[PDB]
Design a binder for this molecule. Structure first.
Ligand SMILES: N[C@H](Cc1ccccc1)[C@H](O)C(=O)O
Ligand SMILES: N[C@H](Cc1ccccc1)[C@H](O)C(=O)O
Ligand SMILES: [Mn+2]
Ligand SMILES: [Mn+2]
Ligand SMILES: [Mn+2]
Ligand SMILES: [Mn+2]
Lengths: 441, 441
């Protein structure tokens, strides 16, 4: 739960206020200014059946408020330069006839008390801001292209956006500025990510421990998800990959419903969300507990590639540089393994991209593919968090590879915090040396 | 998992052909005729992360094909009356560069071999049907208002639909005719629903068996879902309700993230999908294994109401009649329990609706709220499947109820097949008598 002063676990009112300050500092670099960020709605599986609520992550990042159908406004102060501003929440009025179904919601006074924003009003009072926002002298920052909340957009912001679009001061997108902030984690955010990584690591360990041969993919999925949730994870962070044998070579395999035979490996990519931050981990292991000789050759190859790429996660290198290194190292291993017979086959990285068709990694945070418009060519800085997830995939019908490798796929994925010196591996507790894996099984 | 001749487990090629025959017979009762049903797409959590595929249920009902981005067409035959027709599947051409990611897909010959439709072609050949379908002499049956697949609709059927909308022969909806068929289950469908009900009943039993106090809602959720999936359930059928203590009175409680204390009950509404059909079961029990005296009084009242309503599930009665009975019986129990002090309080069922604000039940089948446009005033017929789910809910702040009942909510929900005589309770294996519950906990 929450320590005094916390809005969400580990994250204080002042930390949220400092995020808002930094956003208004970014806007100042770009008369009156207004930022509008919508919350998520409640989504429905069918007309009378709701899904569990998940907040919009940009809304959540800036104020920590975990209820639907709300609007955050940051407004410049008359006679003061940015980054001075006030933060205002607009929330639904209390409605007992709806709380019977959906549960209690915050008052305006409750929203202020929890979050520490300056002011709060009901949604119906948002209209009083719109005349001033409509003026050609008012710069409005709002993500109108793909609104987070279709009805809030339609009712409260689409007329404003269309009115300003025919003016000299059009609405400007803001989510790309929020991404710049989410790119650099605070110590408190790193601690949240560490907790998620340790919890997920334990879920992997228990799933390896109960591995047997043969075993259903659906059972390993069920066990993994049970262990995450029983350990306090709120949700899984993405649909897991639980891909056995040759299905490990299907890169977006999520159906997880086939039997894994004795002598096959499972590729299990699984992560969870805890206190608003995620993990994203992949391990490959033999379900009977013992690597075969070709499985061990291939696995150790990927582990050595991953080791070398993890050592590059220091300030100044970029994900793009690390991807270049990965493809170079994959080419070396394909030669060593006898998969690549002629060195020229990795011209333009052709062989390496054939055997690892995906990138080396991505930014990680409140989302799995965190801040996706931030370039992978950016130099890494302390506080950025990335994955490193090389793999090598040899389809069973790949007659250009040695027969002993056909039908084997391996990926090893860890989550990494860049620091001033050595990277912090959030997923360090999750075994990946072959001897450690065989000991657990 | 398929016997020879089966398209999906338990459902033969000829059973699917007979559903198509019956649909064309319904259309005959309403020159050439064409029925178009789109499949579902692959949905994405974010740009590069797919969810597990689930077929559109109307498409699935009519042909059993479990792959995305496809179109089913039923076409009248020249010079022959309905219900004679041909069934055609249009499927994506195979594409190795996409199969690397999503896995193998069926050929046209594969789709025909699996399903038993008459013909199959790739999507690029769908265009050859459109000139004849656009003709004013061609009646087209197609659900355009909320398309199952936005992109297939935009690319393949929206131009046709708009052209006919500007003609004397507009496109006619068809999903309401499919609902009329899905309303009456075949013996093979009833067997699938029985399997889903037994599996779910076992997951409840396991969750009761390890119940303890205190216990986290999230843990009971994790345990229930594990037990369903471990037994082969494909997915949960809806977000479960795992609501302890006074939260049992929040009717759409799905957050499932609070502690249930010693002396409190849990209301657990959970169901799964197995071989394309769902269950929908609610049980309420004390997490410490022993009903208190007021919990027992309230629980036995709801059980008695439910027993009486289940006994009304015979041909000729309607869901609306059973709802009327439920409200009448609730009024009797509120009086007996001392919640309702004056008999006139159930004038217009006012008190009963206060204490049970939801309906007695709904149709059940491939969907949880199955065939939702079929009237609840229809007389029940053999083969219809419904739920019966009365409850009584006493908020902790309800000062008009005796103090001993405040903060208690009870619902008991079973799934029922109407037969020529007495109903078949699909969920009969799931204990609900108080003695049976206490023995299992
Ligand atoms: N687990 C993630 C996302 C994912 C992709 C496809 C299926 C399931 C999850 C993977 O590491 C990635 O960064 O692409
Ligand atoms: N379990 C279902 C659907 C459901 C509703 C609300 C939350 C979760 C599930 C419930 O019996 C009903 O028929 O309404
Ligand atoms: Mn991953
Ligand atoms: Mn990843
Ligand atoms: Mn239910
Ligand atoms: Mn129900």
């Amino acid at each position: 739960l929450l320590r005094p002063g916390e809005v969400t676990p580990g994250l204080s009112q002042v930390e949220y206020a400092l995020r808002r300050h930094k956003l208004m500092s970014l806007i100042q670099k770009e008369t009156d200014q207004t930022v509008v960020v919508l919350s998520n709605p409640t989504y429905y599986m069918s007309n009378d059946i709701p899904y569990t609520f998940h907040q919009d992550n940009n809304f959540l990042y800036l104020c920590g408020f975990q209820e639907p159908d709300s609007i955050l406004v940051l407004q410049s102060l008359p006679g003061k330069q940015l980054p001075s501003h006030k933060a205002i929440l607009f929330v639904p009025r209390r409605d007992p006839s709806r709380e019977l179904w959906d549960g209690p919601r915050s008052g305006t006074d409750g929203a202020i008390a929890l979050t520490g924003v300056d002011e709060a009003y009901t949604l119906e009072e948002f209209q009083h801001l719109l005349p001033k926002m409509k003026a050609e002298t008012n710069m409005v920052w709002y993500d109108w292209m793909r609104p987070s909340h279709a009805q809030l957009h339609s009712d409260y912001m689409q007329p404003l956006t269309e009115a300003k679009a025919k003016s000299k001061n059009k609405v400007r997108g803001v989510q790309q500025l929020i991404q710049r902030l989410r790119l650099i984690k605070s110590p408190a955010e790193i601690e949240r990510m560490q907790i998620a990584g340790k919890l997920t690591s334990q879920a992997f360990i228990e799933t390896m421990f109960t591995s047997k041969a043969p075993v259903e993919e659906a059972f390993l999925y069920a066990k993994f998800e049970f262990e995450c949730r029983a350990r306090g994870a709120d949700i899984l962070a993405y649909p897991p990959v639980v891909a056995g044998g040759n299905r490990s070579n299907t890169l977006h395999y999520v159906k997880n419903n086939q039997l894994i035979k004795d002598g096959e490996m499972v590729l299990l990519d699984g992560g969870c969300e805890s206190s608003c931050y995620v993990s994203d981990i992949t391990r490959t292991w033999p379900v009977n507990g013992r690597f075969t000789a070709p499985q061990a050759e291939l696995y150790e190859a990927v582990l050595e590639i991953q080791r070398d790429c993890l050592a590059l996660c220091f300030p100044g290198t970029s994900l793009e540089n690390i991807y270049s290194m990965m493809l170079t190292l994959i080419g070396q291993k394909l030669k060593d393994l006898g998969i690549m017979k002629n060195i020229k086959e990795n011209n333009a990285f052709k062989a390496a991209r054939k055997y690892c068709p995906h990138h080396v990694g991505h930014y990680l945070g409140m989302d799995v593919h965190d801040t996706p418009d931030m370039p992978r060519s950016l130099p890494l800085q302390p506080g950025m968090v990335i994955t490193i997830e090389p793999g090598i995939y040899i389809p069973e019908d790949d007659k250009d590879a040695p027969e002993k490798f056909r039908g084997l796929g391996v990926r090893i994925e860890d989550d990494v915090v860049v620091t001033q010196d050595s990277p912090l591996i959030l997923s360090a507790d999750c075994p990946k040396e072959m001897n450690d894996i065989e000991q657990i099984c």
